Structures are given as C-alpha cells and as structure tokens.
Design an enzyme around this catalytic site. Structure first.
Site, PDB file in Angstrom:
ATOM      1  N   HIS A 195       5.652   4.098  12.757  1.00 29.41           N
ATOM      2  CA  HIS A 195       5.914   4.027  11.332  1.00 29.41           C
ATOM      3  C   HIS A 195       7.057   4.993  11.013  1.00 29.41           C
ATOM      4  O   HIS A 195       6.829   6.174  10.785  1.00 29.41           O
ATOM      5  CB  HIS A 195       4.653   4.432  10.563  1.00 29.41           C
ATOM      6  N   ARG A 248       0.807  -1.200   0.000  1.00 24.81           N
ATOM      7  CA  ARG A 248       0.000   0.000   0.000  1.00 24.81           C
ATOM      8  C   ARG A 248       0.855   1.272   0.000  1.00 24.81           C
ATOM      9  O   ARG A 248       1.046   1.904  -1.037  1.00 24.81           O
ATOM     10  CB  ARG A 248      -0.946  -0.002   1.187  1.00 24.81           C
ATOM     11  N   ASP A 249       1.377   1.638   1.164  1.00 26.04           N
ATOM     12  CA  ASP A 249       2.208   2.832   1.286  1.00 26.04           C
ATOM     13  C   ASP A 249       3.414   2.746   0.354  1.00 26.04           C
ATOM     14  O   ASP A 249       3.945   3.760  -0.082  1.00 26.04           O
ATOM     15  CB  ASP A 249       2.690   3.005   2.738  1.00 26.04           C
ATOM     16  N   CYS A 286      10.189   9.015  -0.693  1.00 24.33           N
ATOM     17  CA  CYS A 286       9.632  10.146   0.043  1.00 24.33           C
ATOM     18  C   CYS A 286       9.298  11.272  -0.944  1.00 24.33           C
ATOM     19  O   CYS A 286      10.189  11.811  -1.606  1.00 24.33           O
ATOM     20  CB  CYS A 286      10.632  10.646   1.098  1.00 24.33           C
ATOM     21  N   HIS A 328      10.331   6.471   8.779  1.00 22.24           N
ATOM     22  CA  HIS A 328      10.802   6.587   7.403  1.00 22.24           C
ATOM     23  C   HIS A 328      12.313   6.820   7.493  1.00 22.24           C
ATOM     24  O   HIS A 328      12.737   7.790   8.107  1.00 22.24           O
ATOM     25  CB  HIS A 328      10.132   7.779   6.715  1.00 22.24           C
ATOM     26  N   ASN A 347       9.988   4.310   3.899  1.00 22.31           N
ATOM     27  CA  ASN A 347       9.905   3.589   5.161  1.00 22.31           C
ATOM     28  C   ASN A 347      11.024   2.579   5.289  1.00 22.31           C
ATOM     29  O   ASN A 347      11.624   2.173   4.301  1.00 22.31           O
ATOM     30  CB  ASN A 347       8.559   2.876   5.285  1.00 22.31           C
TER      31      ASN A 347
END
Lengths: 298, 298
Positions: A207, A15-16, A240, A209, A249
């Site tokens: 979470h 997803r992300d 990013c 990064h 991430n």
C-alpha cells in the site's frame, strides 16, 4: 527477473480514501459510486470501515452502505475491522473479508488506536480467530513499515517480528504500507529482500502513498521482487494527514494504466474506472491528483 | 546492478516549461527566477529558446534573458537552437551549450518544424558544426522516441539510425524524450537495451513526461540500465499540448528528492529548488503538478 503476467490490485478508495477527505459524501452517493466500482473489473473493494463512528464521522454509514451496495460476483467486499465488537457489525453487513490493522511503530500505534504493539497484536490475534471461525477471510494492514512520522526510522527487525506474529495468527495476506509516503525504490528493495526471504511473496501486498510521487516507482521495484498485490485508491482520493494539501495513496487508474502498458493483466477495464474516478471528483467538487483522470477529461 | 553513485539532472523549466504555459511571464521575472535556479545546485539550465519569436511568443525575450541572468560558475547555461540564424543570436546571448532538436517520427517532425527527418538531419549536421567551431558544446534533443502522437508506434531501428547520425556529427549528448508521455518501465528497458548496446551510456540523457505519471518509474528502470543524465522541469512546469490539463515533464524536485532518498548524489539543494518552484507557481497563479512542492507548502 521478467515482470509477472498478472497482478491483483485492491481498491480502498471508498474507505481509506473517503475517511481521509474533509468532505461528507451522502450515504447514498457512496453506494452509487461503489456500484460503479463493483462492475469495473476490480475483484476486491474495501466498501467501508467499522471503526466507531466517533473517530471516522466520514464513514458513520458503514453498516448502511455495507447493505446498500449491489455486490457483484467474483468481487471480494472487505471492510476494516477494529475489534470483535466491530467484527460483529461487519458480519451483519455481509463483508466477505475483514482487515485488521496496527502500526509497526510503537509511537504511531499508541498514538492512533492507543495501544502498545503487543496489546494490538493480542487484539488482532483473537479478532482474526473469530473472523475466520465465521468463515471470513482475513487480511492484516501493517502500517508505518517504511518509516514513522514520529519515530522517523523503523528497524526491519520490527516488521519481521510483527509480520511473523501476524502470519502465525492465520491471516491470509499482510499488506505493508507507506504511511508517511517516504519510501524509495532502494528502500522497498532492501525491505522486500529481508521480508520475501521469510514469507511467501503471494501473501504480501503493498500500500504505497505517493505523497512524494514515488508510488509507481516503488511499485516497479516491487513488481521486480515478486509482489503481485497492490492497493490503490480510485482518483487518488484521500489526502495525507501528516502533510495536508498533498495526495495520499496512488491513483488506482494510474496503477492500472502503467501495468497495462507493461503487458501485465489486471482484469480491470480502465475506461470504466476512469469514468468512476471522474464521478466522485465531481461529487467532491475538488480535483483529484490522478494523472490519467486528467487525461481522461481530455 | 547497483544504482549509480551520482546522477546529473538538467533543468529545462525556463524553456520547455515556460513555452508550454499559456501565460506570459514578465521578461524580468524570468531572470529573477533563473537566478534562483542558478544558485540552487543545478549545474545545467536551458535559460531559453532561440526559435523565431513568432512560434514561441512566450519566450520572445530570449536574447534579453540570455544577457540578464546572473550566470554562476560551474553552471552550464544552454539554449535551444533551431538553426544557424538562431545559433548566431545564441552566440550573442553568451549561451555555453546549444541544443539542436528534431523528431524521430517523420510525421511529428514534418508537423512541428516542417522538414523531413533527412532535411532536419542535414540542418543539425551543419548547425552542430558551426556551434562547436565557435567553442560551444552541443547537445541533441531527439523527440518522439517512445511513440508518436500521430504515427503512434515508432520502430527502434529509426531511433538507432538517427542516433547514429546524430553522434556521427559530433554531438556530445543525445537526449531521448517521451513526448506524448506514453512510456513504461518495460519499454524504456527494451529501448535502452538496444541503444546502450551501440552508444556510450554516458552520452545519453532522458527527458520523460509524466503525463501518465510514470516518469519517475521509467527513471528507475533507466537508472538500472546505466543512464545518469535526466532532464527535469522545476515544479513540473509545462503542460502537454497533446493532452491539455495534464502535467508535462517530471518535476525536477520530485526527481531530486527520490534520487536523494536512494542515496544518489545530485548536488542539488532540494530545499532551495522547492523554494524556487513555489516562486513561479505564485507568478503562475496556478498550482503546479509537483508533489514535493505541495509537501513543501506544508
């Protein structure tokens, strides 16, 4: 003091990770890759996002992938849900857990989903209510908690404030994230210090990064504070947007590896994960930032 | 408990970094790059190695570079010295500090410089004696302290044993390194726990390799134990010979950055460093693993 015995890590690559890559992965391939993940040992995977396809064209096949995956037992398949209309589609997809989201920073929030913190708060409020009422576990994604790309600094009182509301709604886990990726072990300590002193550590996830390559470092500090839930992305997928050309991430395998060497159980069979990371990397035709993936490729 | 106020980081890129890159940097360019470094804020730089050019063809211009650099004030220019014959050349080069070296692991030592730990110990012993006698500060590089690529596991008693000898000779700093790069925050804690309980923390430095991307993480644990000396490589130069295609030592800028955010002084002007990292990256025609370098390139 002593590091925890077991720590649950959540995969959010499909997803992300995919929505942050300037490349479209065939709808089928997504399934094929998520299948690998399912039988990797991971117990949680955000298969996709149900945000209107107009904003996330890379994941326009949400409903399709949500019904294509193998769906293994003991695995929690989650999806990002923007609002009631989205929760509807997610319900049809079979998602076990819905993850609402919003930003701690007003500027970031208004310039991302275009709605004030209050407005969003109100949305999630009812979006969570309907979700649970459908026998669905909910999770919140509070972003920009360690600094904003626009407001730069973000007061701790804001996080606490929002965090109190979020938990008051009935969510099960509040995942705090480092959007810009500018958090340091010192910051995560003072922040988690103020938060952990009001909410149960078991209901708080992180979470990070490693746009600045400090993810794992921040993770150690967190492991020391008590957090035992960490989000990761297989291979380190997802760049990013605030800084193109830099990793997003933390690589799930890197997280799983270090944790293993520290004698902390993740129930994730790294070998398999690594194999899965290499797969997408090939479908990506681009090298992923993951360190262990490189080592794996011997 | 509280993180230290100031931490001295040592650059070893022009040496450990260049000798680990399968590319020859023009003798002049080396100088041009080391010049940038000198006026970067760093106060220590291993300009080169005086090991016989036969083994380190990438640094056959040691004596030439040692006399070409600008040599700034307040900067300690060091070089690797294999033995008396080498110390001789280093003396002519003008090196301020000589760094002897050896492996904690017998197998690694014998299969690297071909000499038993005792034999090497004996070498360094006198190599250090002559160095100091020449008004030169000495530093020792004990490698494979966190595991061996051959013997795999390495007992702590070995490190202590050797470390005691090394210090007994009169060295000023013992730099412990993670050769294979398989150290975790838990291991660095028990290790530093046993070491710090016998030797002064001020005389102990750490050389981590984030081949597994755990460098900065291990650094935090060390920062907590008291170590305030860390070795780094601009841009992350130098790959791991044990695992090709993977990064070697931690990127100096990544180290400097994280430390800054933690409010720890390094007296290094990151901006300049980053600029310097990009330079060699271009001369390398290959991208460096450094995370902040990528961010810098916006």
């Amino acid at each position: 003091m002593p590091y925890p015995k077991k720590v649950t890590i959540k995969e959010v690559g499909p997803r992300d990770g995919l929505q942050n890559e300037p490349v479209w992965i065939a709808t089928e391939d997504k399934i094929t890759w998520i299948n690998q993940l399912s039988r990797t040992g991971l117990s949680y995977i955000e298969i996709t996002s149900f945000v209107h396809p107009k904003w996330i064209p890379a994941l326009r096949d949400a409903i399709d992938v949500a019904k294509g995956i193998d769906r293994e037992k003991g695995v929690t398949y989650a999806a990002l849900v923007p609002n009631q209309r989205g929760l509807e589609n997610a319900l049809e997809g079979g998602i076990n857990e819905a993850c609402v989201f919003m930003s701690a920073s007003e500027t970031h929030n208004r310039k991302n989903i275009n709605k004030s913190t209050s407005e969003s708060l109100h949305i999630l409020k009812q979006v969570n209510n309907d979700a649970q009422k459908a026998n669905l576990t909910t999770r919140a994604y509070l972003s920009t908690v360690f600094g904003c790309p626009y407001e730069k600094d973000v007061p701790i009182e804001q996080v606490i404030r929002l965090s109190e509301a979020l938990f008051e709604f009935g969510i099960s886990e509040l995942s705090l994230g480092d959007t810009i990726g500018a958090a340091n072990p010192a910051q995560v300590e003072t922040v988690l210090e103020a938060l952990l002193a009001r909410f149960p550590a078991n209901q708080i996830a992180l979470h990070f990064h490693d746009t600045r390559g400090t993810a794992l470092a921040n993770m150690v500090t967190a492991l020391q504070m008590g957090i035992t839930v960490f989000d990761g992305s297989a291979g380190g997928l997802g760049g990013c947007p605030y800084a193109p050309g830099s990793s997003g991430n933390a690589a799930t395998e890197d997280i799983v590896y270090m944790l293993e060497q520290m004698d902390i159980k993740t129930n994730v069979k790294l070998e398999k994960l690594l194999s899965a990371a290499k797969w997408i990397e090939e479908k990506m035709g681009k090298p992923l930032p993951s360190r262990n993936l490189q080592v794996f490729k011997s």
